[PDB]
Symmetry: D2
Subunit: 331 residues, 4 copies
């Protein structure tokens, strides 16, 4: 009887929500379109809206939603940078799924590092055509190199542990360093500049905020070591992509793996192979021998997707029963 | 001192020229693999430098001793491809045993995650502008069981890394080392227990008489359905034909092979403008869940640097009558 | 009732059908003996080239009172006609666009000769080396066409424009057309011995099944370029693999494949391809496989939809059957 | 005896020139580098220089060559746009191979048309991964469509004949129309503007000159039919590539095949797959779903390459024996 409208849905999302939703007393409607100001009108008559990471939940969208009497905005993801929280004004509540599986993203990040370092993705395309030459595929041992992690949160700290198992030296930067964890894991907090100057490999694992937007830009990349391997499974807006293209052309950047991209919203998760990709930077990034782009799949495991579904359904059950909202996103 | 090198590529040559400039050697580089058909080209040389895919059987060894070869220097850790009994001490054999175990262990982890998370497939889709991720869902390695076969230099580093993923690790070795298993946090088990309880299995033992085709129809029937298998050891560890069947019957979830049982005429060479004659290799290349890379687990700067220097020193040490630290006993 | 439907099929049939007084039901699944039961309560069953319309399927269909089998294709080798027994009628679309297939055939020839597909994969990765991509001029070479029909004749005309010499084999030669087009009928053996390029454009029948097999390929010139936009069963695929391995076959393009029915038109990129020969064929440097898309142009598909839609409109109005397939 | 220096050589070139050159009284030296001002010095002590399509044979290069006493410049190609003829003040002679195989290029042009129309290259990349879906691969019948050929020379005429065999209607533009050939082939000369307005398919087969440089640019592409299929096996400089990108993005261009590219000289024929492609437009062109780029291989058949080698060697023999130079490029 609680009526739920879901945006940006794929078949994998739907199957999970139908299966696990069978034990909840919900009406579930599934839409393919992203939630934006153009589609916000479709929320009319629903109690709960379920949004995802690439929905444009700006003021206009939020106004139309409150106007339509929406009681709850449920985000089926850990990120909320794309919802303009100040504009909600407590006219409805916002919940997210914060800890479905930090391991999924940390593990993926390690995958991406090794893929671009050891050029696994290029190897595969060669051996498929029967090219078994390995010229140009030489990488570097991670062992005893320095990895620099920006964001020592749930994901960042698991990433650090893994890398320490590789016997990498790890340095890290966080707005709120946690020295205890550093002693347990065996890593040293440093400034951003020290991280840039000493890191052979750099990974972004902080949220997108006003302070992190474009934190990786021409100026910060000039401070990195030539041949630095950079990986981003955070948010696309962490990197000024145009500057990334230049730092690739300058051979500052040894290789880069991007699971997210600043203007990904009309592309990612969709098969755009039969039309023009209109974003110039995205097209150009796809033509670099040492760029690996994957469509925001760091989160994408069966454990992670399972927990997102269950935690999302419970977030909603908990709201309708007037229970305390453990996964509220404070506004 | 006159050195004949087989199976050489430009990356090998450049390294051996750069670092060999300090040593008093004549160095001749050949592209061709060392086999019975090419063994005759060793005539007039003091030292032969061989590599992992050379066929150094009795015929090859006989022709070499006949030509007065003093030293066989292997620029690799593996020596399964030298028929040691047939040497008869007519010349010495040296290898480079520990250039970089990290290179291979690290690459092994790279393969696991690539096939699990479909990173190679992702790339091929996004390059064509297909950003759909349907079918690319993987599994968290966290709290799964990895089973390592071969707890040597490489296998032990692999185990440590995976323990960092908080995987449970079980292992099998012909010569268990219980002490390392206590430090690392893993348990030796029989092969049968490994097969039954492993979500991921990695092969890191040498190719011997005992390991040849250990992974075959019968042992794969004991694995968990959906098992992820990775081989950076030797290709002959797997009966490849059975592997094909175990893929087709969906016993195998995904597999990454950095080596292959008949790789000798393919690997390291660009065969993209001719027929691949080996039927199994062609067929393996057509499976959605098979990742084949051309024996590049070892292939890092550090590893290749250390192979070159250790090889050149193996040879310097032999010619100066020094004790051979890296002899392979025969 | 429509089988083996894809979104392109559905959009066309809805757009053009929205004039006609029909209720149309669309199914994704192929028509086989397992799915034939789903025809219950329908009068029009619309089938396509890879449906298994054997006796069991036909029996279940007649049992369910099926009035018309409408084939949205020109080929009908997959419908066991003798078993229908006139318990319902069969219509096809015979001439929607012979040009579509003939033109595509020429595309394939040139793609495998000049390595265009391999070129694309290289340049996409920034490999602009053209080593191994050398081809041959078609000019003054000999092309051998098996099946001089609607498609075969247009193929011949195009190739004659390339100034290729053309020879051809047909069970029912048409000497006239040979004089207009400038080509010579020969035996199969002569075709095999003198052809640099060979194309198959005859129907799959009892007599053409496996006509390309180890024995006939041994008669071909080494380095022959072979293209098949006919039916997969024209080639013994296992022998093709051998003739590729022997380097008898210079390059081959297959738009059709003998066991294509559970693969073609479907995205199988997230599961095992169980057919061993198909997997193996995909690993050869000089094999080009496309998924039965020689017919696939907007004119062809438009004409298929209209001719089909008003093949049905001409059945329900008790009109004579302009496009039947005689049993 | 006669000493020949060859630039921009690949193994295929060398094998042909060694095989066929064994009968001629020549010393033959092979270099990998392109002939530019930076390399022109390497001509010192040679009688004959053999150049190829992407050599930068400007005045500086020509001056350094005449200074070194070079007697003959032999181009192993039909194009000569890249040699600044006015600057060669008859201080040496220039020969080319004009008619090695017009069929090779015309045939390849037809291959490209059908590949981008019927998506054969995209089909291949799909089926290789076991994607047999044909959605998005629908093309058009060429039958009864209009093809527009710019340049009715040796190549253009054979192209026209072939297309007439497809029963296409053909129109053509040439600076020097040949009405007789039009009557034999069945095509009509028209203005460029009429060609742009009525062509479904357009092919470029004129030389690169001062008059053809950038003839295909924003303005001319605005006159084409929406969804036009464009193919260029002429010269890269015939197209303002930046405008091409825009005309692709705005969907004026249905599909394009480029065998040549305006800044191809440091890329084409070379394996650049293990480094950054520094040219932005080329990278971007490689990321369009409906762009097919091949590396200047329209000429590349065994008959063509054979004839280039023999005709080149005879051009040179004929020069040294004071024979009249039938393949001189008038300066
Ligand atoms: N690609 C994908 O599928 C996924 C991406 N994400 C992204 O990864 C991000 C990290 O997530 P968690 O580890 O769960 O977040 P978290 O909220 O546990 O930890 C983030 C850490 O970043 C730090 N931080 C905050 N602002 C900072 C600043 N201005 N500079 C440096 N550090 C700062 C905090 O101290 C915190 O420790 C999420 O915000 C989300 O954007 C999350 C899940 C999946
Ligand atoms: N893909 C690549 O590029 C490379 C592959 N390798 C392969 O890995 C092996 C070298 O590995 P390392 O760990 O450095 O060698 P190692 O000698 O350090 O370790 C070998 C381990 O396997 C064990 N072993 C021997 N027979 C066994 C059996 N039947 N069952 C289980 N374990 C057995 C040994 O007892 C030892 O614990 C080589 O033999 C080679 O075949 C080595 C280098 C590179
Ligand atoms: N790949 C694709 O998308 C398409 C494939 N086709 C295939 O091509 C075949 C021919 O199509 P159409 O030219 O429209 O048919 P058609 O109108 O030409 O009739 C078939 C021709 O094949 C000849 N033929 C019959 N038996 C023969 C034998 N034993 N040996 C040699 N030749 C023989 C006939 O004499 C006739 O000239 C179709 O039956 C179908 O299988 C048709 C349409 C599309
Ligand atoms: N992609 C490749 O591999 C190859 C490309 N080419 C290109 O194709 C051209 C050679 O074609 P061919 O047909 O052998 O040349 P051709 O010299 O036989 O014919 C050239 C035609 O272009 C016409 N033309 C000249 N200036 C013109 C202008 N300003 N506007 C319009 N038309 C004009 C001429 O009247 C003549 O009909 C070369 O000049 C070269 O640029 C040639 C060989 C290979």
């Amino acid at each position: 009887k609680t009526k739920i409208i879901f945006f940006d849905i794929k078949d994998y999302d739907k199957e999970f929500f139908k299966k696990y939703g069978a034990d909840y007393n919900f009406e579930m409607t599934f839409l393919k379109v992203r939630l934006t100001e153009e589609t916000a009108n479709l929320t009319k008559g629903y109690d709960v809206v379920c949004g995802f990471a690439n929905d444009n939940i700006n003021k206009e969208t939020i106004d139309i939603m409150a106007e339509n009497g929406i009681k709850l905005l449920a985000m089926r993801c850990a990120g909320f940078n794309n919802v303009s929280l100040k504009d909600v004004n407590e006219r409805f509540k916002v919940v997210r799924v914060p800890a479905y599986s930090p391991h999924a993203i940390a593990e993926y990040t390690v995958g991406l590092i090794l893929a671009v370092n050891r050029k696994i993705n290029k190897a595969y395309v060669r051996t498929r055509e029967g090219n078994f030459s390995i010229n140009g595929l030489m990488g570097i041992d991670l062992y005893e190199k320095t990895a620099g992690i920006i964001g020592t949160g749930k994901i960042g700290q698991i990433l650090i542990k893994i890398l320490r198992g590789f016997d990498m030296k790890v340095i890290a930067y966080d707005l709120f360093p946690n020295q205890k964890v550093a002693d347990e894991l065996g890593f040293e907090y440093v400034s951003l500049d020290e991280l840039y100057a000493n890191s052979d490999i750099i990974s972004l694992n902080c949220p997108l905020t006003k302070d992190t937007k474009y934190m990786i830009n021409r100026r910060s990349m000039l401070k990195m070591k030539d041949g630095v391997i950079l990986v981003n499974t955070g948010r696309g807006m962490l990197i000024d992509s145009a500057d990334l293209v230049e730092a690739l052309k300058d051979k500052k950047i040894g290789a880069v793996a991007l699971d997210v991209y600043e203007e990904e919203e009309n592309y990612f998760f969709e098969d755009k192979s039969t039309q023009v990709i209109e974003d110039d930077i995205l097209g150009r990034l796809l033509s670099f021998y040492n760029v690996l782009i994957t469509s925001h799949q760091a989160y994408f495991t069966k454990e992670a997707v399972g927990a997102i579904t269950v935690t999302t359904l419970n977030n909603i059950k908990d709201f309708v029963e007037g229970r305390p909202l453990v996964n509220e996103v404070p506004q």
